Design an enzyme around this catalytic site. Sequence first.
Site, PDB file in Angstrom:
ATOM      1  CD  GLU A   1      -3.033   1.111   2.117  1.00  0.00           C
ATOM      2  OE1 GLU A   1      -3.568   0.348   2.945  1.00  0.00           O
ATOM      3  OE2 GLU A   1      -3.049   2.357   2.229  1.00  0.00           O
TER       4      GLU A   1
ATOM      5  CG  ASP B   1      -1.457   4.672   1.504  1.00  0.00           C
ATOM      6  OD1 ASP B   1      -2.581   4.385   1.041  1.00  0.00           O
ATOM      7  OD2 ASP B   1      -0.685   3.844   2.025  1.00  0.00           O
TER       8      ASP B   1
ATOM      9  CD  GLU C   1      -3.102   7.684   4.492  1.00  0.00           C
ATOM     10  OE1 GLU C   1      -4.048   6.887   4.667  1.00  0.00           O
ATOM     11  OE2 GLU C   1      -2.054   7.648   5.172  1.00  0.00           O
TER      12      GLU C   1
ATOM     13  CG  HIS D   1       0.814   1.232   5.029  1.00  0.00           C
ATOM     14  ND1 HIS D   1       0.059   1.026   6.165  1.00  0.00           N
ATOM     15  CD2 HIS D   1       0.864   2.575   4.852  1.00  0.00           C
ATOM     16  CE1 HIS D   1      -0.328   2.193   6.654  1.00  0.00           C
ATOM     17  NE2 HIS D   1       0.146   3.151   5.874  1.00  0.00           N
TER      18      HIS D   1
END
Length: 430
Positions: free
Chosen positions: A212, A214, A217, A228
């Site tokens: 993951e 990202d 955010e 992640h």
Amino acid sequence: QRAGNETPENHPPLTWQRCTAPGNCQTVNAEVVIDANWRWLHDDNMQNCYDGNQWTNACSTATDCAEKCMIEGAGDYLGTYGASTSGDALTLKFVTKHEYGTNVGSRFYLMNGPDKYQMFNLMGNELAFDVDLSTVECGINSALYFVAMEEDGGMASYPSNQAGARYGTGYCDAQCARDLKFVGGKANIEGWKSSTSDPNAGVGPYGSCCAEIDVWESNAYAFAFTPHACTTNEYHVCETTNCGGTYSEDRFAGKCDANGCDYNPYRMGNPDFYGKGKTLDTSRKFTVVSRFEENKLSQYFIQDGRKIEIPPPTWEGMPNSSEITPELCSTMFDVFNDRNRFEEVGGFEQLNNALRVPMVLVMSIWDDHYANMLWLDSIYPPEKEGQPGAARGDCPTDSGVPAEVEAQFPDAQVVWSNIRFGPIGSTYDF
Ligand SMILES: OC[C@H]1O[C@@H](O[C@H]2[C@H](O)[C@@H](O)[C@H](O)O[C@@H]2CO)[C@H](O)[C@@H](O)[C@@H]1O
Ligand SMILES: OC[C@H]1O[C@@H](O[C@H]2[C@H](O)[C@@H](O)[C@H](O)O[C@@H]2CO)[C@H](O)[C@@H](O)[C@@H]1O
């Protein structure tokens, strides 16, 4: 499961563009589709295969639902899922009270054809774009990010789901989606438990996990850049106790890192920089530039023609820079004092691995019912406060309550646009 024949699935367009040189970028006439969780479920005669947040009598088991049911298309992304497009511009309106209900949020993916997805050459390449979250208030999240969902929405690998990418199937992340109506191409019906707050959502024993990434955010008050990592950085199906993240019994009980190594600026001690009128003034549009390189991550901004740097962490012990590095990821966890799954699942190498996995450019707006987004824009966790990493943003602690927040500003919206990608330093001249 199968495809629903009552509705024809409409895929809005969305030009984006590969970037050869910082000036010679070429445009892609892409399209977009929504995740299957926002789509209607039914048996061969109007009767649903699930409802509210309860699966139905029209359905019995996981392996039976995949065959007896089918998913339909949305169509009115304007009037139903509040989405919109202006060429390169796009819009997702937070609360969406359509004629027969009130839908909350959206989630979209890039599409290299109606059957196919847009995977991306991550490592050694950068992602750009621009966002107008100018009225995205505390409690909400407008997120842009990559993840290794297989090119055909999990249709190849899974024979029972003959819908796939064109209807938004096969999603996974570091949270492991136990909330997914279907997983591994079957239903999450057997043992399905519906929460208290979310009348649309529930949680099934089958979540799908994968790497993951990202970079984004955010909100009008705060943000984070966060990778992640998983043992298995790719799509994988987890099973109950062996699932982790949000919907599981233990967060770090899995194959993946659901907390991860974030750069949350205000969390790092630079509290007067990002926000309305702030250094990085979020009452008006601005540009993010995110690069992804071996053992290091970087991200600038460009506002009013001006290239904006990133605040370094105040915190003694911690390295002086924005750049994501082991020096960060290491001197980060006991300092702040949290559970380290970053290196518990294999340091910057496993992420230097994660990086080299083909990714998809997600785009989302939501509201968290579980932490009231406190983990992004306030004092989190409020199990104590008064320590580093606690804080996060300028937002308060009773904020993020989905309802109440869905009542004060239900017309707020994120405006995703100008997405750029290419070799490092090739979507802007900085
Ligand atoms: O409310 C719209 C949509 O919600 C879906 O559940 C969402 C959840 O609300 C969101 O916070 C989370 O990030 O994603 C899940 C599903 O991935 C629900 O599945 C839909 O029925 C509903 O239309
Ligand atoms: O559990 C809420 C939220 O956490 C996000 O990561 C959090 C982590 O869970 C929290 O304990 C720590 O203090 O902060 C990090 C991020 O700053 C996670 O990414 C979300 O999916 C999850 O909803």
